[PDB]
Design a protein around this ligand. Sequence first.
Ligand SMILES: [Ca+2]
Ligand SMILES: [Ca+2]
Ligand SMILES: [Ca+2]
Ligand SMILES: [Ca+2]
Ligand SMILES: [Zn+2]
Length: 316
Amino acid sequence: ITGTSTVGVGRGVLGDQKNINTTYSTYYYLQDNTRGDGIFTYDAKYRTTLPGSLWADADNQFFASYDAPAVDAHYYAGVTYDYYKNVHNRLSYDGNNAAIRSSVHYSQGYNNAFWNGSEMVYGDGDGQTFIPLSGGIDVVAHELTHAVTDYTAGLIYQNESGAINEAISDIFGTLVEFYANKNPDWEIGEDVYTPGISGDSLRSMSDPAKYGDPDHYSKRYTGTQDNGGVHINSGIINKAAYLISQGGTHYGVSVVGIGRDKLGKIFYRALTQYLTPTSNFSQLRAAAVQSATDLYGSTSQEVASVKQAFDAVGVK
Ligand SMILES: [Ca+2]
Ligand SMILES: [Ca+2]
Ligand SMILES: [Ca+2]
Ligand SMILES: [Ca+2]
Ligand SMILES: [Zn+2]
């Protein structure tokens, strides 16, 4: 829409109050003109037709419970755009400031959220397994990172390349969660998953086996479910990324951590310059080693730690 840029206030899924960038033109719209070609948030009104209607509000205050998932989708897409711009110098997901669109209230009781190739889509959850998925900043950044991947490496969504695709989304969703300093951790989706149970999450990067995902290449899923285990076998790479950052000893192999910042620089470089659509885990290890070599030198501690981490999860 064409209008005047302004700032409104509302409450997110978790009850926290935040300011959001909106546009005024008769109604106040969830349209943020301050980032790239804009961030637009739509109401899918419990249907599956997309994108639905651009979110319009009469007084620029978003405190209704129906408003909450829109508030956070809009606000966390703005924080993810900021992270990629300020930390990695990338303007939006295509690198040329493409507009970011998200629809909330997709379908009824839908327990998922996803990047469909053109925009973000979020379910409200059934209220037991999940609450509205846009309340999780790691979920939002995980999904928006698939858009980055689609425009750069282009990893296909199956077998080892899909598991790399998923792990890259978990890694950067986690780094965004640390950049916003939103009670940060190495788990995924703990703010929106099972409201009635405290302490769990969908997946864990520090200990993937806690929820049953493999933490070593010899434990990888080899069947056909979940497009060859994209959400299961991503635990092997998540554990390697956690070790590179934080250090530790895993199956008797010791890794000195080099921190989150270098973790992000190495993986971002591997993703945008060396990964291809059909890269496998062994090619990710080579890409990460080469990236670390470009940035820190072939005899750095950083290169050494990337090697030990992949060795610890059995990836040669
Ligand atoms: Ca209102
Ligand atoms: Ca957290
Ligand atoms: Ca998390
Ligand atoms: Ca829970
Ligand atoms: Zn994903």
